[model samples]
Target: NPVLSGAPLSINVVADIGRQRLIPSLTDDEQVLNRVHACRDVVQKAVRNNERIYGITTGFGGMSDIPIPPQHVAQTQDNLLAFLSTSTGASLDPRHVRAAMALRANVLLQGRSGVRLELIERLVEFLRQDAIPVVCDLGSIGDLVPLGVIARSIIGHPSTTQVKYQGEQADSHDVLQQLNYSALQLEAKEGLALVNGTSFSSAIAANCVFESQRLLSLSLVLQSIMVRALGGHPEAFHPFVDENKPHPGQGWSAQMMRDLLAQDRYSLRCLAQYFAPIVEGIAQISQSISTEMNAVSDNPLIDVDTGRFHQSGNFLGQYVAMSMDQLRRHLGLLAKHLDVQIAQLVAPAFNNGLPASLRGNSSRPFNMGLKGLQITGNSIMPLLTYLGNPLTEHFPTHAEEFNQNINGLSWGSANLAWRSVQLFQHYLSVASIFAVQAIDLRAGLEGRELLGETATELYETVYDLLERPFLFNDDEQSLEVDLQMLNGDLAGAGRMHEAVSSVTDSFLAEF
Candidate 1:
């Protein structure tokens, strides 16, 4: 298998770094060492000259006034590492961990994190080796992310009130020894660098954003399945739909869906406007996040051109937090349309007189209609919609701004606005899986083979699911398991992109 390529080197990279490569040992390289050395030289000179630096020599947040004894400065840095080791929750998936590692490397590569060279290399080593330490999902607030609490802990770093190296199911020594690798010890700034920023959180959000893009793409492709299943007007997805509506999203959806139908014209000119906006909305959100990922985001950044260190809110993550929040809202809207599309796929009114549900041969016992597949559609729409709620409503974070002056640093209140777009995407993944199943199920019911090159490719891979046990009724329990399993299968087969593309071709060709 090819190692993933071209992960984001910056905020710019985040927009589209799905399946990109992030070398784990870049921090260990001599060139990166030279950059860190240059940055540290500037910082040390500033510190000796009695020039102030934020979050490094000076206190962060509530403790900015306390002067650190020079003797204990290294210890203070260690304390920052330990204090940051507070993130707690369910661990992140392996992909997120890998992505986070890659993203963090990019930030450090921008030569701003004031971290050492070996430490950076070690992070890259983890990815190249695939011995990814598990990270949980619960810790971040989106803005001012405190991920180190959990993120750095997995690499054998220790801290107070934090979960220790005590083995849960097995001993650390034994686990590492078994794998022929011992636990890594934390050096100065290693912990601080790992947990300090929004890269991990952003990577989580990025994965979701990528999925949303795929989902939006899939939404249009699945329309072909609907077209074949519902027998609706092929003219629905026309370039003219946008000419009349003038909504970019509506037009894109119409044009893409029209392409999928493979039809001469849509049956109705305006139908694409109904579902195309979701695609456009997600695109807008994705672009913003990507730009932020590449830009410098650290405080007290060293200006290479000016050869000076300055304090600022470069690391403040409000923009990413807001983008993710907005992304969640867009996903919710996307889910709403997916539900409608599913309805059109299975319902008689919208489905153009198809069976109540896309039943299978197994209904042989009760003679029930294929509402089994339709029932699956019913659950998916609402579940995803509810998951989207937090994205739309803004909540007060400072509690009447009570903590207004908790420290010399006044909280910006943007942290409260930052919500989890990743969690929302987890729900969206379910929706995507369901959408695929519904479309594939519809194909099976109509006995219409996914024709042409692209359809055949997806069908060849997706067809294996049907062989396991025929879906007789849209058994919610059974279908749910299948969807979960299908999630894995779809991921493995890389079906989302192709599925959408094939649908686009079918929609356009048939029309």
Candidate 2:
């Protein structure tokens, strides 16, 4: 765990912080604080001298022309928070709210938001204490909704403002009072500064990106097991084919596949070509998401060097939205890849010598085998392609007052990408189970064993699942319950994915 010392943030660090695996603190260096203070001084002076500012001394959005009297600045700030606190949908996970808060704090720490250092300190304190605002999952078009959650969590009355305090949902005022703390008063432009950025979108995108990468790792592991269990040829994964193609993703994936299989004796071998692009696509998306995580996405940036406020559209979240849409595309392809491998694993002609549908030594009248699982996997394939359709270009133009003609639709894009990945998880679970069954049946018929240590580990784990009577056994019963339970286990925060990931990392470490 490292402190938030104004250092450039990375996707891994952001994910770690969001999961509460890392602690965050501002830099103790006076130089950083001085710049932060300098920016705040400029804003304070501008407000006191009655200089016309976009959001500080006046209104926001299309109402930027309206002016706020000097005496009513604080009241205007309160009004801004209250007005924006109208978000209504499912609440986001506490971790995502905390991640967004950390991101907002870092942008302010850049000393370009004209926010007081105390504001950032308070945000950091929220992270330190785990007192998260009750931010809804909706309201992705703008930062106003999430930022409003923060403002309300901080300055709203005890009975009115909802927050997650010490693992329970409670009123913000009650949490503050119980902690023996008082809410700070908002200053000119502070409320606007809090909610007028892309931190919320970035946090959501970062988490999605991390999960996508993790799943990609798991996919590689499962694909390798499928190749081994089906007795597929490893020559297709040789480095020479990738050299001719010259795609870096292909080369990396081919080399890893070769390394895992060593010397294949199977006949079917089409995995490297199919799986390479998926690996490459997800890697590219991860890089783009990392770029978004490190970016400063606030609006009306303050220049402490020249005492100037530059009004701009830094709040536009097209980059994150588009990147997540790209992520959806990658996951879609990965799901298809898994579906194909599952088909190969279950089909006897394609699987070399395995039984049809991986039926066990049960009574002939009772064994359903993996027939239903393949249909379940096929059922989800069409959805993956539909979810991958470009979300950035799908929104209709805004019509009211022409105030907003362009829509980023980032929230919609992110939510769709999130759902796609979730379904892909279930798809992977089916593929892994099919691979395990194929390996078991193949070993029984051909007197063979899984090749590598990682493959063996994954195989044994999946075998252990069948030992439970709740799963597969020599009984006359529907296997639907067993399949559902296995799917949940494969996708959960459990050892199945971890076992797969460790082997994937070992193969990745080779090249």
Candidate 3:
């Protein structure tokens, strides 16, 4: 008989589940359940025979060689969570915590973690009830600290941990009682399974994949508007240019641009080539992230067919660390691309015969239109460049007494990816304001009909917010309110997703 498998997850599902767009459910495939049962028996046999399994019968990390008496096994599980539970900085958003819960559940579902189905069931329940744990955002090597926040929540440490159930923050014990749930009494290997994997980092990188995808598509639309506003040389978008020199991403980008002039005078001309690698990189990185998501990512593998233990280093988070680092690098190029495009549209010297600084009211000399947004872009660009610095090369060896020597700082890399995604949004804040201002100025000078059918539609979809005229309040003209709303709307606004679906929906469809 064929091995039964659950519905394979993607970054899309993980992201949606993270944000509460989808209710998560795991497969109760009997074959998988039997394998889980078999793995649990292996752990049980190890304890009964005093077989000296690493985490199952002995202590962890530097204590790996030390023996734990059978009586203390349960306490050891809690001890592991308590000791590793140290996290720093702000707690993660509900979305990130939600994704980590789902990821851990999925990892256990593979039967390699030797968990009872109840543990898996509890995760799905937490998500279904929106009873999310408040995981901290920083400090992890293999997500030990981040996932520990999650593990102890399962252990029901109300005094020490917090959770959000039905969108209210409270202690875990109360949240469990309110939800009519019981706290898990973790057995040997269960705590290790909970805290040892790369779920937090993977959850974060999954979010990056989808968000980066959105920015990539939206950038195209904004570039198109900019091109139209500037009276772009149509030759820049010629298919012949990309066809002969076809990098896969360049071709897809070119095909998408076969219609938008979204532009070195060369930025305009080389848009496809410029966006090629960032487009290609997201697909490449998603494959790496997806592997980490479903594949078992804990130590001491159990052969479900034979019920034996082989202590392995599967728990290492190198995959997630390297993926996030690569993602950060891709985002830097995107930020640079957006910065240059913004420069092209705003400055009269660069902008083709347009008003200086894309000022909506360029007639008034004192009205420094968009100069502040330009300055904001300049300030933000350096940080994006800084984020692109590779982090995996500098792993410290002293964690857990060098037993985890050369740790994968996947958590830190994911945090950087998360921050880069946010910084890219700042670029978008500037880009969005510039796109509309440039187009509106150009349309008044050149006519709305001249901007073409697709960009006109994109303009209107984006124009919805500008229509409210919140760009100013009582003539003070602070962009604080303006950018906050658009950045949130632009970053998550589903209408923009729908608006660009014609190009974005099918983009990199294979990935």
Candidate 4:
């Protein structure tokens, strides 16, 4: 817990720094540096005595029985760095690569991993320099296969490693030349030090945790508007409803919306219950992710207390796998609730006598207002539904000559959670248009004060994006294009919080 004391980094900070390409300044605190150097001395003594060290003076994985000559030790680490780059898959979102770099640096700074301060400094330098490595997200049941791509870029030549530079992809050697740097001198065990950890898993989960919270807050803001647009009351989201049962998240949801609704269908009524579990689940998962972000995840840590090598299974990514599996489910639950909310808003019978599909008064039978758009929402639902299949349940193939017969697919699951977050954002975007069109139609129908001031404020923020009502054409597929733009706006860091803050700034920001 002492590590938690001075570390300014949290899950939110890491994700924001990553998504926005912000730079992190490393700690120069004497206590942290003293222990880091102390542990390095212990490791250096072990190698000087030619004592056994896993993947250091000895061979890696199942090949550990063989010993490396003292002269060839550094070459062996660089060799380990290069061969694992030949993995297959689409590249990761570059933000995750930056996040992974920071997480790795933080882990080594704990003083147990025995990596030199220069190595950790260079990791942060790459982040500050904005030179993110291009890494394929797959092939990581454990991290080595995935993190190897980043390690390969760290020490290899221009032909061997690749990085994203100046809005263009270039070989690592070229970017280092542009930045005026040289290749990493990967001393003994440094290659294994970089590649053997849960940083990739933890970083991706951290970003998912952030984006999911945005979705929850934004959805609550929408449901507030939908309840008013449907001419519903505040009975469902009222604090009294949860006072009897007392699920804390439900209490918070009701408390937040009671002021916003100041303003239910089941989507409006069970709003608290539908969203409560995800709030609770994300709260738990965020704690787990923050712990992993600072965890010293490596093999052969120097036990500075006793001045000896401590071989650890700390590198195993099991907790990260389980955390994202639960998070992946929580993400799908949000999409499911939003899908139900969209269903009621578009149907006239359910929407308190609004126009069918909220179609415009165009004097045309073929004028299907948002029928095509509604169909698209149905299409995005299956994307969330299938992503809920547990990534942890499918066991990994035994790797490294069966030395890694049972590995945790932490990064794989974390990677899928990021993709799910994007898919749900698009689905959530469609729901936003449905609520807006439904509300605008209601206003024109009755010309009465249907919505509360706060709810109307929420409406104006999203409507400000398109700047007009969108009911004119039934045949216009251009609506699909506009929905894409809504999603794009939502994707900006803190964009939803800034937009919805007009109404629920107090509640949204806290979550």
Each model's TM-score, in the order given?
0.76, 0.90, 0.93, 0.92
Error of 2 at 501 (Å): 4.0
- Stretch of 10 with least lDDT, candidate 1: 407-416
The global Cα lDDT (0 to 1) of model 4 is: 0.76
* Overall lDDT per candidate, in order of appearance: 0.50, 0.73, 0.76, 0.76
Model 2 alpha-carbon drift over 4 Å, by segment: 157-159, 262-270, 460-494, 502-511
Candidate 4's C-alpha runs over 4 A off are: 1-8, 157-159, 262-265, 447-454, 475-477, 501-511
lDDT of candidate 1 over 1-511, digit per residue (tens): 2222223453323433334333333534555567677766665665566555555556655676776655555566666755665455654455665666667666666666666554555555545555455555554444233446333434544442222122333332443444455555543334455555666656665666665565555545544554544555665555654798787667666655555554322323345666555555566666665665555555556765466766655554556655555555665665566556555555555554444454444446654443554455556555555545443134335521342221111111112112223333344444444344455555655532544344334444455553441344444345556555556554544454565565434323322
Best by TM-score: 3
Lowest lDDT block of 10, candidate 2: 466-475
lDDT of 3 by residue, 11-50 (tens): 8888888877888866657887777788888777777777
Q: Judge candidate 1 at residue 276 and give its lDDT.
A: 56
Question: If the candidates were sorted by their TM-score against the true structure, best first, what order would they fall in?
Answer: 3, 4, 2, 1
Q: Model 3 residue 494 lDDT?
A: 61
**Residue 58 alpha-carbon offset, candidate 1, angstroms:** 2.3
Per-candidate alpha-carbon RMSD to the true structure: 6.2, 3.3, 3.1, 3.1
